[PDB]
Design an enzyme around this catalytic site. Structure first.
Site, PDB file in Angstrom:
ATOM      1  N   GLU A   1       0.811  -1.213   0.000  1.00  0.00           N
ATOM      2  CA  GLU A   1       0.000   0.000   0.000  1.00  0.00           C
ATOM      3  C   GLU A   1       0.845   1.265   0.000  1.00  0.00           C
ATOM      4  OE1 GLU A   1      -3.149   0.156  -0.407  1.00  0.00           O
ATOM      5  OE2 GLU A   1      -3.893  -1.886   0.069  1.00  0.00           O
TER       6      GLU A   1
ATOM      7  N   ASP B   1      -6.293   6.428  -4.826  1.00  0.00           N
ATOM      8  CA  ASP B   1      -5.848   5.053  -4.881  1.00  0.00           C
ATOM      9  C   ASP B   1      -5.914   4.574  -6.339  1.00  0.00           C
ATOM     10  OD1 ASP B   1      -8.543   4.238  -5.351  1.00  0.00           O
ATOM     11  OD2 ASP B   1      -8.709   3.186  -3.416  1.00  0.00           O
TER      12      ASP B   1
ATOM     13  N   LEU C   1      -8.728   4.010   2.806  1.00  0.00           N
ATOM     14  CA  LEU C   1      -9.734   4.605   1.943  1.00  0.00           C
ATOM     15  C   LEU C   1     -10.587   5.574   2.752  1.00  0.00           C
ATOM     16  CD1 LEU C   1     -11.359   4.604  -0.727  1.00  0.00           C
ATOM     17  CD2 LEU C   1     -12.673   2.668   0.179  1.00  0.00           C
TER      18      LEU C   1
ATOM     19  N   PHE D   1      -8.345  -6.369   3.085  1.00  0.00           N
ATOM     20  CA  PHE D   1      -7.898  -4.997   3.236  1.00  0.00           C
ATOM     21  C   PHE D   1      -8.117  -4.220   1.944  1.00  0.00           C
ATOM     22  CE2 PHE D   1      -5.260  -2.097   5.823  1.00  0.00           C
ATOM     23  CZ  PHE D   1      -4.898  -1.187   4.875  1.00  0.00           C
TER      24      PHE D   1
ATOM     25  N   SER E   1     -12.576 -19.887  -5.606  1.00  0.00           N
ATOM     26  CA  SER E   1     -11.204 -19.824  -5.112  1.00  0.00           C
ATOM     27  C   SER E   1     -11.158 -20.231  -3.637  1.00  0.00           C
ATOM     28  CB  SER E   1     -10.614 -18.438  -5.230  1.00  0.00           C
ATOM     29  OG  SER E   1     -10.587 -18.006  -6.579  1.00  0.00           O
TER      30      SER E   1
END
Length: 163
Positions: free
Chosen positions: A11, A20, A32, A104, A117
């Site tokens: 990040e 972002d 955010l 996150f 997945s």
């Protein structure tokens, strides 16, 4: 390596409001602020988060405070989510960090949507999981980051983060 160091790599650290990868107002280590296009709305969220009038700039200590909260919130999100918690409980600590990283970045609901997945992960079909994970908007929009996180799920090592 741990989830904090991992996310700090992914990040970055910026002490002034920035946008972002999706064009949304953000500060610190990937905190955010809002999806609104209003910079004023973002500054209001920032001041609420830090508890003072910051006029769009924070300290490193403040950024790390928000980050610690945000990592905690990601883990809390996982543990309270009926799709995510069984998979997370099944994983070793390294792969748990990969899951936290995803939440996150994309939020609990978004990751809970990776049904196929998640099943492969729970089954410990690591190579299959890794192939399935990359068939995603996530991979296509942030491929270098996604490749690191996927490598972490595939191998259960920190090899993608030995930068």
């Amino acid at each position: 390596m741990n989830i904090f160091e991992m996310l700090r790599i992914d990040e970055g650290l910026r002490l002034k409001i920035y946008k972002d990868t999706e064009g949304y107002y953000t500060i610190g280590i990937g905190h955010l602020l809002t999806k609104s296009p209003s910079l004023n709305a973002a500054k209001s969220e920032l001041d609420k988060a830090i508890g003072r009038n910051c006029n769009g700039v924070i300290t490193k200590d403040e950024a790390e405070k928000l980050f610690n909260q945000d990592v905690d919130a990601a883990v809390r999100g996982i543990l309270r989510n009926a799709k995510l918690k069984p998979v997370y409980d099944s994983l070793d600590a390294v792969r748990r960090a990969a899951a936290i990283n995803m939440v996150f970045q994309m939020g609990e609901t978004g990751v809970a949507g990776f049904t196929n997945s998640l099943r492969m992960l729970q089954q410990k079909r690591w190579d299959e999981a890794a192939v399935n994970l990359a068939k995603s908007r996530w991979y296509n929009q942030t491929p270098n980051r996604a490749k690191r996180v996927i490598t972490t799920f595939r191998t259960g090592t920190w090899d993608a983060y030995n930068n």
